[PDB]
Amino acid sequence: HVTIREATEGDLEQMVHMLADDVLGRKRERYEKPLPVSYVRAFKEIKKDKNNELIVACNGEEIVGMLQVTFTPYLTYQGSWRATIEGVRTHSAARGQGIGSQLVCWAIERAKERGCHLIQLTTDKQRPDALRFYEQLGFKASHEGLKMHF
Amino acid sequence: HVTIREATEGDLEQMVHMLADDVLGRKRERYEKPLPVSYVRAFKEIKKDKNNELIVACNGEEIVGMLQVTFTPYLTYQGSWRATIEGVRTHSAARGQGIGSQLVCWAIERAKERGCHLIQLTTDKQRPDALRFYEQLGFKASHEGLKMHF
């Protein structure tokens, strides 16, 4: 049983820790106290944009899941807005408890509320169970997720 | 010989026609005169948002290529901004002239200018030559592109 809501500054420390604890994020993130200002600057930018949100699943004050969702207009699909979900993470000590599913389902309803006609995301091919998780929700792996790091 | 620039309202008609002529897009679009209101509304919302850009490749006033690119802040990658390219299209009568490559390279430089640390996009697996096209530009098919249409 979890409470799902938009994140606030008070959740930042736990969110960064979750990101750094990820099998893949561990190689890209930097968790430390005090928190790196780069995360703070990003949080502020996200906060001021109403169409860019950080969502957390909570067990009281304990953050057990997170994701970012962005609502954007496009000309395609007859000018349809799309919701893109990014970095869905579940607490490493809470796997298999349906937290990820609740968080994504919540985000999907949020997207419908915003008038989006489709929801999308890219999942790393190195995560064996991710594809299955999303297909179970009704997502289709119709596209190749291409990335280029500078 | 094409010039690249941000699209304006006057390019909308040709942009929608290009989308409606796409091998896959034809099924989801509706090109008509006057254009369905949703396209016009979408273009205005995009044009207004400085972090959401519609780019066109031009041969005079004639649109021969197009793409949309969005610059977004994320918590991941230590608060890194990312550029997401969506819907790179080239005129059917201007294929194999390096227009797509020019558009994408233009977007890549734009992302760097914006302070993005990564550029990404999803291409339909039904476009057999799209994967090679992007891999040759430096993109890696590291993720599965998942979609859900409502």
CSV table of C-alpha atoms in Angstrom, one decimal:
chain,number,residue,atom,x,y,z
A,1,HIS,CA,0.0,0.0,0.0
A,2,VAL,CA,1.5,3.3,-1.2
A,3,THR,CA,0.7,7.0,-1.4
A,4,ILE,CA,1.6,8.5,-4.8
A,5,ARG,CA,2.2,12.3,-5.2
A,6,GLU,CA,4.5,14.8,-6.8
A,7,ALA,CA,7.9,15.0,-5.2
A,8,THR,CA,9.0,18.0,-3.1
A,9,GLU,CA,12.5,19.2,-1.9
A,10,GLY,CA,12.1,16.9,1.1
A,11,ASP,CA,12.3,13.8,-1.1
A,12,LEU,CA,15.3,14.8,-3.1
A,13,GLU,CA,17.9,13.1,-0.8
A,14,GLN,CA,16.0,9.8,-1.0
A,15,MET,CA,15.4,10.1,-4.8
A,16,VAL,CA,19.1,10.7,-5.5
A,17,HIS,CA,20.1,7.8,-3.3
A,18,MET,CA,17.6,5.5,-5.2
A,19,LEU,CA,19.1,6.7,-8.5
A,20,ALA,CA,22.7,6.0,-7.4
A,21,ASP,CA,21.7,2.6,-6.0
A,22,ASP,CA,20.4,1.5,-9.4
A,23,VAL,CA,22.4,-1.3,-11.0
A,24,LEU,CA,22.9,1.0,-14.0
A,25,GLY,CA,22.6,4.4,-12.4
A,26,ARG,CA,25.4,3.5,-10.0
A,27,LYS,CA,27.7,4.2,-12.9
A,28,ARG,CA,26.2,7.5,-13.8
A,29,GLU,CA,25.0,9.1,-10.6
A,30,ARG,CA,26.7,10.8,-7.7
A,31,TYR,CA,25.2,10.3,-4.3
A,32,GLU,CA,26.8,12.2,-1.4
A,33,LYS,CA,26.0,14.5,1.4
A,34,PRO,CA,25.6,17.4,0.8
A,35,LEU,CA,23.9,16.5,-2.5
A,36,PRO,CA,25.6,17.7,-5.7
A,37,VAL,CA,24.1,21.0,-6.8
A,38,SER,CA,23.6,19.6,-10.3
A,39,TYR,CA,20.6,17.6,-8.9
A,40,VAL,CA,19.3,20.7,-7.2
A,41,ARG,CA,19.4,22.8,-10.3
A,42,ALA,CA,17.6,20.1,-12.2
A,43,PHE,CA,15.0,19.7,-9.5
A,44,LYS,CA,14.2,23.5,-9.6
A,45,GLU,CA,13.9,23.5,-13.4
A,46,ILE,CA,11.5,20.5,-13.3
A,47,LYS,CA,9.5,22.1,-10.4
A,48,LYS,CA,8.9,25.4,-12.3
A,49,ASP,CA,7.6,23.5,-15.4
A,50,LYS,CA,4.1,22.3,-14.8
A,51,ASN,CA,4.4,19.8,-17.7
A,52,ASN,CA,7.5,18.2,-16.3
A,53,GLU,CA,7.0,16.2,-13.0
A,54,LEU,CA,8.8,14.0,-10.5
A,55,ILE,CA,6.4,11.5,-9.0
A,56,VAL,CA,7.2,9.4,-5.9
A,57,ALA,CA,5.5,6.3,-4.3
A,58,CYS,CA,5.6,6.6,-0.5
A,59,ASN,CA,5.4,4.4,2.5
A,60,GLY,CA,4.9,7.2,5.0
A,61,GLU,CA,8.1,9.3,4.8
A,62,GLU,CA,9.9,6.4,3.2
A,63,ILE,CA,10.2,6.9,-0.6
A,64,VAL,CA,9.8,3.4,-2.2
A,65,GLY,CA,9.5,4.4,-5.9
A,66,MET,CA,10.0,7.3,-8.3
A,67,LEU,CA,9.7,8.3,-12.0
A,68,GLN,CA,9.7,11.5,-14.0
A,69,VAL,CA,6.9,12.2,-16.5
A,70,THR,CA,6.9,14.9,-19.2
A,71,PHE,CA,3.8,16.0,-21.2
A,72,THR,CA,4.6,17.4,-24.6
A,73,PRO,CA,2.7,18.6,-27.7
A,74,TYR,CA,3.7,17.2,-31.1
A,75,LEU,CA,2.3,17.7,-34.7
A,76,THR,CA,2.1,13.9,-35.2
A,77,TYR,CA,-1.0,11.8,-34.5
A,78,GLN,CA,-3.0,14.9,-35.6
A,79,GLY,CA,-1.4,17.3,-33.0
A,80,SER,CA,-1.5,14.8,-30.1
A,81,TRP,CA,0.2,15.5,-26.8
A,82,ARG,CA,2.3,12.6,-25.5
A,83,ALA,CA,3.5,11.7,-22.0
A,84,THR,CA,7.0,10.4,-21.8
A,85,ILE,CA,8.0,8.4,-18.6
A,86,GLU,CA,11.7,8.3,-17.6
A,87,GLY,CA,13.7,6.5,-15.0
A,88,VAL,CA,11.1,4.4,-13.2
A,89,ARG,CA,12.9,3.2,-10.1
A,90,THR,CA,11.6,1.0,-7.2
A,91,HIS,CA,13.3,0.7,-3.8
A,92,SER,CA,15.9,-2.2,-3.9
A,93,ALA,CA,14.3,-3.6,-0.7
A,94,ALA,CA,10.8,-3.5,-2.1
A,95,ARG,CA,11.0,-5.5,-5.3
A,96,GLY,CA,8.1,-7.7,-6.3
A,97,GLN,CA,5.5,-5.7,-4.3
A,98,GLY,CA,3.7,-4.1,-7.2
A,99,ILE,CA,5.0,-0.6,-6.5
A,100,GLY,CA,6.4,-0.1,-10.0
A,101,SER,CA,3.0,-1.0,-11.5
A,102,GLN,CA,1.1,1.3,-9.2
A,103,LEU,CA,3.4,4.2,-9.9
A,104,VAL,CA,3.3,3.7,-13.7
A,105,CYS,CA,-0.5,3.2,-13.7
A,106,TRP,CA,-0.9,6.4,-11.7
A,107,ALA,CA,1.3,8.3,-14.2
A,108,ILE,CA,-0.7,6.9,-17.1
A,109,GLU,CA,-4.0,8.1,-15.6
A,110,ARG,CA,-2.3,11.5,-15.1
A,111,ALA,CA,-1.4,11.5,-18.8
A,112,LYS,CA,-5.0,10.8,-19.8
A,113,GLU,CA,-6.1,13.6,-17.5
A,114,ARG,CA,-3.7,15.9,-19.3
A,115,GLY,CA,-5.2,15.0,-22.7
A,116,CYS,CA,-2.3,12.9,-23.9
A,117,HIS,CA,-3.1,10.3,-26.6
A,118,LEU,CA,-0.2,8.1,-26.0
A,119,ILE,CA,2.4,7.3,-23.3
A,120,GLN,CA,6.0,6.3,-24.1
A,121,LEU,CA,9.3,5.4,-22.6
A,122,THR,CA,12.6,3.7,-23.3
A,123,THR,CA,14.0,1.0,-21.2
A,124,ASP,CA,17.7,-0.2,-21.2
A,125,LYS,CA,18.1,-3.5,-22.9
A,126,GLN,CA,20.5,-4.5,-20.1
A,127,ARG,CA,17.5,-4.7,-17.7
A,128,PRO,CA,16.2,-8.3,-18.5
A,129,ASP,CA,12.9,-7.9,-16.7
A,130,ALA,CA,12.0,-4.4,-17.7
A,131,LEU,CA,10.6,-5.2,-21.1
A,132,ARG,CA,8.3,-7.9,-19.6
A,133,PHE,CA,7.1,-5.4,-16.9
A,134,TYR,CA,6.0,-2.9,-19.5
A,135,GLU,CA,4.5,-5.4,-21.9
A,136,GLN,CA,2.4,-6.7,-19.0
A,137,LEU,CA,1.0,-3.2,-18.6
A,138,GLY,CA,0.0,-3.1,-22.3
A,139,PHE,CA,3.0,-1.3,-23.8
A,140,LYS,CA,4.4,-2.4,-27.1
A,141,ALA,CA,8.1,-2.5,-27.9
A,142,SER,CA,7.5,-1.1,-31.3
A,143,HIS,CA,10.6,1.2,-31.5
A,144,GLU,CA,14.3,1.1,-31.1
A,145,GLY,CA,15.5,3.4,-28.3
A,146,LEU,CA,18.6,5.3,-29.6
A,147,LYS,CA,20.9,7.3,-27.4
A,148,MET,CA,24.0,9.4,-28.0
A,149,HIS,CA,26.0,10.7,-25.1
A,150,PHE,CA,28.3,13.7,-25.5
B,1,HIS,CA,21.2,22.5,-51.4
B,2,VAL,CA,19.1,23.1,-48.3
B,3,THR,CA,19.0,25.7,-45.5
B,4,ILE,CA,17.9,24.7,-42.0
B,5,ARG,CA,15.8,26.9,-39.7
B,6,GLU,CA,13.0,26.8,-37.2
B,7,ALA,CA,9.6,26.3,-38.8
B,8,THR,CA,7.0,29.1,-39.0
B,9,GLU,CA,3.2,29.1,-39.4
B,10,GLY,CA,3.6,29.3,-43.1
B,11,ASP,CA,5.4,25.9,-43.2
B,12,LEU,CA,2.6,24.1,-41.3
B,13,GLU,CA,0.6,23.0,-44.4
B,14,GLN,CA,3.7,21.4,-46.0
B,15,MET,CA,4.8,19.9,-42.7
B,16,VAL,CA,1.4,18.2,-42.2
B,17,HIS,CA,1.4,17.0,-45.9
B,18,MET,CA,4.8,15.4,-45.2
B,19,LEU,CA,3.6,13.6,-42.1
B,20,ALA,CA,0.5,12.4,-44.0
B,21,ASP,CA,2.7,11.1,-46.8
B,22,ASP,CA,5.0,9.1,-44.5
B,23,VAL,CA,5.0,5.3,-45.1
B,24,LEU,CA,3.8,4.9,-41.5
B,25,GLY,CA,2.4,8.3,-40.6
B,26,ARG,CA,-0.2,8.2,-43.4
B,27,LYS,CA,-2.3,5.8,-41.2
B,28,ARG,CA,-2.4,8.3,-38.2
B,29,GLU,CA,-2.6,11.7,-39.9
B,30,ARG,CA,-5.3,13.7,-41.7
B,31,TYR,CA,-4.1,16.2,-44.3
B,32,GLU,CA,-6.9,18.5,-45.5
B,33,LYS,CA,-7.6,22.1,-46.5
B,34,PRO,CA,-8.1,23.9,-44.1
B,35,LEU,CA,-5.9,21.8,-41.8
B,36,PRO,CA,-7.7,20.1,-38.9
B,37,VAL,CA,-7.7,22.5,-35.9
B,38,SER,CA,-5.6,20.1,-33.8
B,39,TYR,CA,-2.5,20.6,-36.0
B,40,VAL,CA,-2.9,24.4,-35.8
B,41,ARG,CA,-3.3,24.3,-32.0
B,42,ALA,CA,-0.3,22.0,-31.7
B,43,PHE,CA,1.9,24.1,-33.8
B,44,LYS,CA,1.1,27.2,-31.7
B,45,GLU,CA,1.8,25.5,-28.4
B,46,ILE,CA,5.1,24.2,-29.8
B,47,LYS,CA,6.1,27.5,-31.3
B,48,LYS,CA,5.4,29.3,-28.0
B,49,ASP,CA,7.5,26.9,-25.9
B,50,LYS,CA,11.2,27.8,-26.3
B,51,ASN,CA,12.4,24.3,-25.3
B,52,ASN,CA,10.2,22.6,-27.9
B,53,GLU,CA,11.3,23.3,-31.5
B,54,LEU,CA,10.0,22.4,-34.9
B,55,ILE,CA,12.9,22.4,-37.4
B,56,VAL,CA,12.7,22.4,-41.2
B,57,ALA,CA,15.1,21.8,-44.0
B,58,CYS,CA,14.3,24.1,-46.9
B,59,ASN,CA,15.0,24.4,-50.6
B,60,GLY,CA,13.7,27.9,-51.0
B,61,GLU,CA,10.2,28.1,-49.5
B,62,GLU,CA,9.7,24.4,-50.2
B,63,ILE,CA,10.0,22.2,-47.1
B,64,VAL,CA,12.1,19.2,-47.9
B,65,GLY,CA,12.7,17.9,-44.4
B,66,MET,CA,11.6,18.2,-40.8
B,67,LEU,CA,12.0,17.2,-37.2
B,68,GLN,CA,10.9,18.2,-33.8
B,69,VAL,CA,13.4,18.4,-30.9
B,70,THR,CA,12.7,19.0,-27.2
B,71,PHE,CA,15.2,20.0,-24.5
B,72,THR,CA,14.2,18.7,-21.1
B,73,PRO,CA,15.8,18.7,-17.6
B,74,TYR,CA,16.0,15.4,-15.7
B,75,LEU,CA,17.3,14.2,-12.3
B,76,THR,CA,19.1,11.3,-13.9
B,77,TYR,CA,22.8,11.6,-15.0
B,78,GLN,CA,23.3,14.1,-12.2
B,79,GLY,CA,20.6,16.4,-13.3
B,80,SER,CA,21.5,16.3,-17.0
B,81,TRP,CA,19.3,18.0,-19.7
B,82,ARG,CA,18.5,15.8,-22.7
B,83,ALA,CA,17.5,16.6,-26.2
B,84,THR,CA,14.8,14.3,-27.7
B,85,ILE,CA,14.4,14.2,-31.5
B,86,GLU,CA,11.0,13.1,-32.8
B,87,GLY,CA,9.7,12.4,-36.3
B,88,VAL,CA,12.6,13.1,-38.7
B,89,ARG,CA,10.9,13.2,-42.1
B,90,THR,CA,12.3,13.9,-45.6
B,91,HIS,CA,10.3,14.8,-48.7
B,92,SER,CA,9.7,11.8,-50.9
B,93,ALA,CA,11.1,13.6,-53.9
B,94,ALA,CA,14.3,14.6,-52.0
B,95,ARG,CA,15.4,11.2,-50.7
B,96,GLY,CA,19.1,10.2,-50.5
B,97,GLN,CA,20.4,13.8,-50.6
B,98,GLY,CA,21.8,13.9,-47.1
B,99,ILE,CA,18.8,16.0,-45.9
B,100,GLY,CA,18.0,13.7,-42.9
B,101,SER,CA,21.7,13.7,-41.9
B,102,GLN,CA,21.9,17.5,-42.1
B,103,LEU,CA,18.7,17.9,-40.0
B,104,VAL,CA,20.0,15.5,-37.3
B,105,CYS,CA,23.5,16.9,-37.2
B,106,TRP,CA,21.9,20.4,-36.9
B,107,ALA,CA,19.8,19.1,-33.9
B,108,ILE,CA,22.9,17.5,-32.4
B,109,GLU,CA,24.8,20.8,-32.4
B,110,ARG,CA,21.7,22.5,-31.1
B,111,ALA,CA,21.5,20.1,-28.1
B,112,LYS,CA,25.2,20.8,-27.3
B,113,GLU,CA,24.5,24.5,-27.5
B,114,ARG,CA,21.6,24.1,-25.0
B,115,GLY,CA,23.9,22.3,-22.5
B,116,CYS,CA,22.4,18.9,-23.1
B,117,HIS,CA,24.7,15.9,-22.2
B,118,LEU,CA,22.7,13.4,-24.3
B,119,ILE,CA,20.5,13.3,-27.4
B,120,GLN,CA,17.9,10.6,-27.9
B,121,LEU,CA,15.0,9.4,-30.1
B,122,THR,CA,12.9,6.3,-30.9
B,123,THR,CA,12.5,5.0,-34.4
B,124,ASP,CA,9.8,2.5,-35.5
B,125,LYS,CA,11.2,-1.0,-36.0
B,126,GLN,CA,9.1,-1.1,-39.2
B,127,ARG,CA,11.6,1.3,-40.8
B,128,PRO,CA,14.3,-1.2,-41.8
B,129,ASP,CA,16.9,1.5,-42.8
B,130,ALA,CA,16.3,3.9,-39.9
B,131,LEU,CA,18.4,1.9,-37.5
B,132,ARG,CA,21.5,1.9,-39.7
B,133,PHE,CA,21.0,5.6,-40.5
B,134,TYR,CA,21.2,6.7,-36.9
B,135,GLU,CA,23.9,4.2,-35.9
B,136,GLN,CA,26.1,5.7,-38.5
B,137,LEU,CA,25.5,9.2,-37.1
B,138,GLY,CA,26.7,7.9,-33.7
B,139,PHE,CA,23.5,6.7,-32.0
B,140,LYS,CA,23.4,3.4,-30.1
B,141,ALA,CA,20.3,1.2,-30.0
B,142,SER,CA,20.7,0.7,-26.2
B,143,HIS,CA,17.0,0.8,-25.3
B,144,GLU,CA,13.7,-0.6,-26.2
B,145,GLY,CA,11.2,2.0,-27.4
B,146,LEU,CA,7.9,1.3,-25.7
B,147,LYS,CA,4.6,2.9,-26.7
B,148,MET,CA,0.9,2.8,-25.5
B,149,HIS,CA,-1.8,4.5,-27.5
B,150,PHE,CA,-5.0,5.4,-25.7
